[PDB]
Structures are given as C-alpha cells and as structure tokens.
Structure 1
Amino acid sequence: LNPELVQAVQHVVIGPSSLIVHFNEVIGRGHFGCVYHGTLLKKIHCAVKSLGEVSQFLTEGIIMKDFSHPNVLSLLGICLRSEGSPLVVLPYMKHGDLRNFIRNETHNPTVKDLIGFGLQVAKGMKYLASKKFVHRDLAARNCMLDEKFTVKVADFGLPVKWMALESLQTQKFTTKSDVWSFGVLLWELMTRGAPPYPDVNTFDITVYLLQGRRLLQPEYCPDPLYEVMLKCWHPKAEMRPSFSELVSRISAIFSTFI
C-alpha cells in the first residue's frame, strides 16, 4: 500500500475506542444486506455496512469523508480491522430507502411531497456533481429518509433500466448519465415505486430507447415535471440539463403547484 494513502486515510478511520457494532442487530430485517446497528460514543445511532481493492476503498473513504450537505448521506468513518471485513459507518436512516417508503401501502405522501423528495435528490446531486462525483447507480432504492423525512443520496449496491443510452453502449459514466438516472428516479417518485419499463426486458432496453421511446407520463404527474424527465432522457448527453438547472426548474414547479 502507498504510504501516503495510508497517512491521508487515517482521518477517516474509526475504531473500537468510539464505535460499538451490534452484529446481532440487522437493519431493516435484511433489506440492505449486511448492515448492522451501531453506536458512536455522547451517543450517535449509525448503520455499519460490512464488505488492490483496499487502495480504491481507502481513496473512496477519503473522498466521501468530505461530503457535507443536507441531501447527501455522510460517511461518518471506515474500519480497517486486522481480523474481519472492512466496515463503512454511515448515519442511521430512520425511514430506510425512498423506493420502499413510497411503495409501502401504509405510507401516502402527497403529489407535492413526492416532488419535494425529487427536489431534495436534485440538490444532493447538484452537490455531488460540483465535487466531480459520478454516482453510477442513482435510483430511489439508493436514497434514504431520515426522522424528519429529509432525503439523502446514498449507495447500498447492472441497473440497465436506469442507465443512459451511452452508458449501455460504451460502458462509460458521467454526471450527464446521472441526470438520465435522476429522470427515472423522478418517474419512480411519481409512480410511487413502480418498476420502470415493465413490458421491456433488460436486453431490449437499448433498442427501445434508440427508437426514441421513453417512459410514459404517470397519472397525477404534472406536465411541467414530465417535460423535465424528457429533458433528462435526451439521447445527446451534452444536451441534458445540469443538476443546477434541475434544482431551479423543480423549485419553480414545487412552489407554484396547486
């Protein structure tokens, strides 16, 4: 391991002197996989995700440790223990992921609340793009809801039905292909967690998109908001709106919505 990477990652490292990991306490009955309840000691409730590649993990830890924004889930720290797997320590999200929350028949957020959630994902994505951070897996399942219903962009994971055309063809990813995925997320929000392209199988998604065909406008989705989704799925990556434009446009729709 490069000794400078080791020096630079020490500020991200957390150990047993402050972190109690409750390995017999899984979060959300197994929804997120190997993610356990944790306590950071002055008590803080956290989520402890259990996982050459070590180099890239330390690098990501450094990058994610800097994230500070109300709509981006924070990296509280990482564990690099002599015995066992690497751990990722994140803040505990009271209402789990966004897809599950809105799919649940016992939750009924209004049309305006769903637009509000989308506005929050846009703001988190505007911040991530400002740091040149390409997500590669932006979906409702990867957005978390805290105790005050604040949406926080996160990653708990090919999601071919969320990828942009150029990513399906060339395998390359950019902030512009994240904008495409954001459009599908807005669709998930307006459909209340319905799966995108139910009649189009994974292997034929590219041909469906090349034919100029897109996700249909969900009922109760405002026409200006559907226009925004269509801009997110522009076949030319350079013509898609930025997350700053998506914030401006969605705030306008949100504040005027009747």
Structure 2
Amino acid sequence: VHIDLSALNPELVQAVQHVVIGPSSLIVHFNEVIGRGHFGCVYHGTLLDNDGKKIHCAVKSLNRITDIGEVSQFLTEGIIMKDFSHPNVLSLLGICLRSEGSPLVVLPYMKHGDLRNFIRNETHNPTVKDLIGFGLQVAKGMKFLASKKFVHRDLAARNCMLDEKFTVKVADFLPVKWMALESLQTQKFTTKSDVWSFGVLLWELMTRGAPPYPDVNTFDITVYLLQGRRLLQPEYCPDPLYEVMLKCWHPKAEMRPSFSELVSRISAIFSTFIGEHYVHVNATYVNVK
C-alpha cells in the first residue's frame, strides 16, 4: 500500500490488533457479493475458527483511497462492535490484516437478511407470537446497548438482521419517521429517543413491514404529530402491545418506559400467546413505499 498509515492515531484507533485474525483463518469469495450502497462492498466469506472449523460470514472491505481518513472511519466503525457481545446485537468476528490495499471487517453471516424484508415476504407465515418475539429480541439488544450508554440513532426494522435460528441481531447498515418529537425539534438523540423508535419498530412488525405514515409529506412529520396523532393500531396488534407503543411515544421523553421495563412488559404479553394467530397484510398497505 502507498498510504502513510502510522500517521493514524494509536490512542484513537487503539486495539485494531486486539481483535485481529491472522491472514490465514479467513477466506474471501470476491465473486459473490451481497452489499450494495453508496459505500459498502460486502462479499460472502468463510473463516475457519479455532482449528476445525468453517464459519460462514460477511466480510467488509473498502475501496482504495482516499487518504488516512476513510481508513480511520472504516476501522473505527468496526471497533464500535468490539465489546458488543450480546446474542441480540450484531457483533464483530475480527478484522483481517493484509497489505496492498483494503483492510477487512468480518461479521457473522445472516441467512435471512434484514428483519423488514423477511416479514414483507409473502411466502413467510408469521404468527402474532413470532412477531412479538422478534420485537422482544430487539428490546433485549437495546437494553444491552443502553446499559453501555450506546445511543443507536437509527433503530428500525430495516437495520435488524435475522439469522438461521431466527435470532434477531440489532445492527446498523434522516429517518424522521422513526424520530421522537424532541429529536425532530433538536437534532439530539438519547436512549429515551431510541424508545420512540422502538415503538415505531413494533408497529412495522405488527403490520409486517408497512411504511409508517405513508400519506404524510415526510418533510414535516412534526406538524403532523403535534396535531395530536400517532400511528394507528394494526389489525393484528394486541391491545396491550398497542398500549406499549403509545408509552414508547410519550410526549415527555422521561415518562417513556426503559428498555428493561419494555423487556419485562413484552415478555409477559408474549407468554400469553400459543402461536395460533396468523398475521396477514392489510390490502391498503400492499405495494406502498
């Protein structure tokens, strides 16, 4: 590589070598990619853990240049997950270190991709229990992150991964439609504002991926909310769960339930179901963006 890297920041990007995986225990399949965005070239990959022992994963690579800046963010955006060790939070397997260019960020591969798409798929047959369970898992992930003073900022069904055992992992690939009033007013985000977002996530779940507030100009959703509105109760959403969304949307940020109380309340509601209520999509929501 022809970039001066040690000009980086030892104390800033300290410990990228603490979670390093020797350029051997990992294998990349540059011919099969799954990531498409303004940035983010993710290909399927296999990394042999321990000494057996093949593990399927998603490798995060970067595009040559620019200077030491893009290299700094990419790495920093990887050390963000270093300590994130919770079954409902998307973790970092490691970062492989080779030269000649791009560095690698390795994530556990997720068979079912993102939550929103999984639920929108007409061939899937979720029950109220299934959907509430996904919501309970997200809450458990958030309770973990909140314990670590980590403010997500973009909690939403599109940012949650679903793995082969159907384990939801909170992740992150302006989302004003998921934002609390006070944050729409002052672009300041807190744990209490992630709760507002969680409520909206619960709604996406109960409607099976419908877009919230389809009719409103997206621009000012604030004037809309201030009129005294909230998302309507989805057909298959149990009354008690709807009372929870209404609590997550409390006008006073501090009156909102914490993620611990949410785990408690939702787990109760979840226990009452046996899996005998199938959830269908509302005709008026189908094909809506």
TM-score, normalised to structure 1's length? 0.91
Q: Percent identity?
A: 100
Higher helix share: 1
Q: Relative to structure 1, is the Cα distance of residues 2 and 30 closer, same or farther in structure 2, using a 3 angstrom cutoff? A: closer
Q: Could you give the per-residue CA deviations for residues 125-146 of structure 1, whole angstroms, max 9, x where no partner exists?
A: 1001101111111111111111
**Farther-moved stretch of structure 1 (232-241 vs 26-35):** 26-35
Q: Relative to structure 1, is the Cα distance of residues 197 and 16 closer, same or farther in structure 2, using a 3 angstrom cutoff? A: same
Shift of 1:78: 2.8
Q: Could you give the per-residue CA deviations for residues 11-55 of structure 1, whole angstroms, max 9, x where no partner exists?
A: 133452222221211127989962210111221100123345644
Q: Could you give the per-residue CA deviations for residues 202-229 of structure 1, whole angstroms, max 9, x where no partner exists?
A: 1121111122211000001000000100
Instruction: Give me the whole-angstrom Cα distance separating, in 2, the residues matched to 1:7 and 1:34.
Output: 25
Instruction: Give me the whole-angstrom Cα distance separating, in 2, the residues matched to 1:117 and 1:219.
Output: 18
Instruction: Give me the whole-angstrom Cα distance separating, in 2, the residues matched to 1:217 and 1:83.
Output: 55
Instruction: Give me the whole-angstrom Cα distance separating, in 2, the residues matched to 1:199 and 1:163.
Output: 17
Instruction: Give me the whole-angstrom Cα distance separating, in 2, the residues matched to 1:195 and 1:149.
Output: 23
Instruction: Give me the whole-angstrom Cα distance separating, in 1, the residues matched to 2:264 and 2:18.
Output: 36
Q: Which has the larger radius of gyration?
A: 2
**Farther-moved stretch of structure 1 (102-111 vs 166-175):** 166-175
Q: Could you give the per-residue CA deviations for residues 139-165 of structure 1, whole angstroms, max 9, x where no partner exists?
A: 111111111111111111x11111111
What are the ranges of 5 or more consecutive residues in structure 2 without an aligned counterpart?
Answer: 1-7, 63-68, 275-289
Q: Relative to structure 1, is the Cα distance of residues 56 and 106 closer, same or farther in structure 2, using a 3 angstrom cutoff? A: same
Instruction: Give me the whole-angstrom Cα distance separating, in 2, the residues matched to 1:85 and 1:167.
Output: 36
Instruction: Give me the whole-angstrom Cα distance separating, in 1, the residues matched to 2:180 and 2:104.
Output: 31
Q: Relative to structure 1, is the Cα distance of residues 22 and 242 closer, same or farther in structure 2, using a 3 angstrom cutoff? A: same
Q: Relative to structure 1, is the Cα distance of residues 92 and 201 closer, same or farther in structure 2, using a 3 angstrom cutoff? A: same
1:186 partnered with 2:202: yes
User: Aligned residues, how many?
Assistant: 257
On the 8 A contact 1:5/1:58 being kept in 2, the answer is no
Instruction: Give me the whole-angstrom Cα distance separating, in 1, the residues matched to 2:44 and 2:109.
Output: 8
What are the ranges of 5 or more consecutive residues in structure 1 without an aligned counterpart?
Answer: none
Shift of 1:89: 1.4
1:164 partnered with 2:180: yes
- SS of the equivalent of 2:176 reads coil
Q: Relative to structure 1, is the Cα distance of residues 39 and 249 closer, same or farther in structure 2, using a 3 angstrom cutoff? A: same
- SS of the equivalent of 1:177 reads helix
1:23 partnered with 2:30: yes
**Farther-moved stretch of structure 1 (14-23 vs 195-204):** 14-23
Q: Could you give the per-residue CA deviations for residues 174-217 of structure 1, whole angstroms, max 9, x where no partner exists?
A: 11111111101100000000000011121121111122211000
- SS of the equivalent of 1:3 reads coil
Instruction: Give me the whole-angstrom Cα distance separating, in 1, the residues matched to 2:9 and 2:126.
Output: 49
On the 8 A contact 2:96/2:104 being kept in 1, the answer is yes
- SS of the equivalent of 1:209 reads helix
Instruction: Give me the whole-angstrom Cα distance separating, in 1, the residues matched to 2:236 and 2:39.
Output: 30
**Farther-moved stretch of structure 1 (12-21 vs 218-227):** 12-21
| Aligned position for 1:127 | 144
Q: Relative to structure 1, is the Cα distance of residues 50 and 235 closer, same or farther in structure 2, using a 3 angstrom cutoff? A: farther
Q: Relative to structure 1, is the Cα distance of residues 164 and 78 closer, same or farther in structure 2, using a 3 angstrom cutoff? A: farther
On the 8 A contact 1:12/1:61 being kept in 2, the answer is no
